[PDB]
């Protein structure tokens, strides 16, 4: 564990691949490998450089589209949503440091073991020192994900994420189905709708309808803070998804969310009771 560290408290896997591919130092190995094993809900954050950062002028990434694709079986590029359905990837870039961040959130449930890599090629970059023209190298990250233990106690209306959520139904032309779930403390829940549907309130779980306060548009932070959540607006498959879990929250909570279209509408209803226990 030289560049990739996994903190258990935050369940965060931070990998730094900058000085390892720096083209200013003589290097004995052209391919530097680092392996990481991840489980449900783990978060992988890789901090890589850009073309603007010095010594990484001709830097590039493989697959060139990180947010969408990965190197499946360390071989052929494949959309990450295909092998890890319900995952969430984000790309950040700090112009002050010329450094980007690839952030991967593993879904709360992984139905099948998955192995895939990500390459960071800096071989094309170079520097000139003394009578030498030093070059960069490439670094490969091999990520393995275990089986995900338990199906999320959430709702799925796309019908595609049946293995991920407890409730799944194939979308119908005209339907007003409403999914009700009872969740406890430190239990996962979520929803899955089609991307072109309207989310109500927008970016749900972060701003849920305050059913106690008569279905009020308010940030969930006001209702509670001992919660963890995530959400993707549209994946490669064209579906919006969100997840939530309460952590040492003593207050009983009831909130809701809605995906609506001109043809049908679907509603998620969740009841957080810390004393509630699954049958």
């Amino acid at each position: 564990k030289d560049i990739c560290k996994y903190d258990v408290t935050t369940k965060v896997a931070t990998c730094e691949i900058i000085d390892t591919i720096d083209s200013s130092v003589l290097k004995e190995h052209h391919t530097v490998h680092y392996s990481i094993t991840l489980s449900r809900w783990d978060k992988l954050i890789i901090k890589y450089p850009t073309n603007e950062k010095t010594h990484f002028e001709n830097f590039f990434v493989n697959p060139f589209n990180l947010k969408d694709k990965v190197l499946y079986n360390y071989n052929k590029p494949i959309n990450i949503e295909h092998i890890l359905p319900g995952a969430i990837t984000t790309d950040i870039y700090d112009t002050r440091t010329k450094i980007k961040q690839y952030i991967l959130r593993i879904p709360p449930y992984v139905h099948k073991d998955i192995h895939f890599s990500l390459e960071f090629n800096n071989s094309l970059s170079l520097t000139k020192q003394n009578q030498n023209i030093i070059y960069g190298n490439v670094a490969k990250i091999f990520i393995h994900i275990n089986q995900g233990y338990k199906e999320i106690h959430g709702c799925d209306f796309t019908g595609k994420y049946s293995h991920l959520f407890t409730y799944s139904k194939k979308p119908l032309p005209n339907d007003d189905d409403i999914c009700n779930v009872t969740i406890g403390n430190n239990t996962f829940s979520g929803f899955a709708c089609l991307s072109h549907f309207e989310l109500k309130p927008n970016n749900c779980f972060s701003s849920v309808y305050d059913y106690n306060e008569a279905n009020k548009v308010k940030k969930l932070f006001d209702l509670s803070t001992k919660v963890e959540l995530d959400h993707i607006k549209q994946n490669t498959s064209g579906y919006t998804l969100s997840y939530i879990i309460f952590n040492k929250e003593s207050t009983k909570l009831k909130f809701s969310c809605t995906c609506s279209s001109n043809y049908s509408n679907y509603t998620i209803r969740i009841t957080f009771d810390p004393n509630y226990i699954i049958p």
């Epitope: 290097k27 004995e28 052209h30 000139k128 030498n132 030093i134 070059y135 190298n137």
Partner: nanobody, 125 residues
């Protein structure tokens, strides 16, 4: 340990192409860094193309940049220098130099830093 041999160079009309090949014997090319060197009549030896031991980091001098391309057939143990759009300045005795280093990502600039050299082949345009 490694002996170099150039081949495939002669007279061409301005605007043509050539493929200079350089074969090694004694040890595999992967264990050596490779470079092509220029030398016109009564002038010093300059570097045109270079190649680290990684085989993927190729350097091209600004003179031949955008027209020359280096390659390494490790099966045939040969380095190929493709030279397209040949211009009157390219007229020189092209040499093939190889050095031995335990680093895979660097290439030397001065011809003195290269212990092993090969008998150059003349390329006139």
């Amino acid at each position: 340990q490694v002996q170099l041999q150039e081949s495939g160079g002669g007279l061409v009309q301005p605007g043509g192409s050539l493929r200079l090949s350089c074969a090694a014997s004694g040890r595999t090319f992967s264990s050596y860094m490779m470079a092509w060197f220029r030398q016109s009549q009564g002038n010093e030896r300059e570097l045109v193309a270079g190649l680290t031991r990684s085989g993927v980091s190729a350097y091209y001098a600004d003179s031949v940049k955008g027209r020359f391309t280096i390659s390494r057939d490790n099966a045939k143990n040969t380095v190929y220098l493709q030279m397209n759009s040949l211009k009157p300045k390219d007229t020189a005795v092209y040499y093939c130099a190889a050095a031995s280093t335990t680093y895979i990502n660097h290439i030397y600039t001065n011809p003195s830093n290269y212990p092993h050299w090969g008998p150059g082949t003349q390329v006139t345009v």
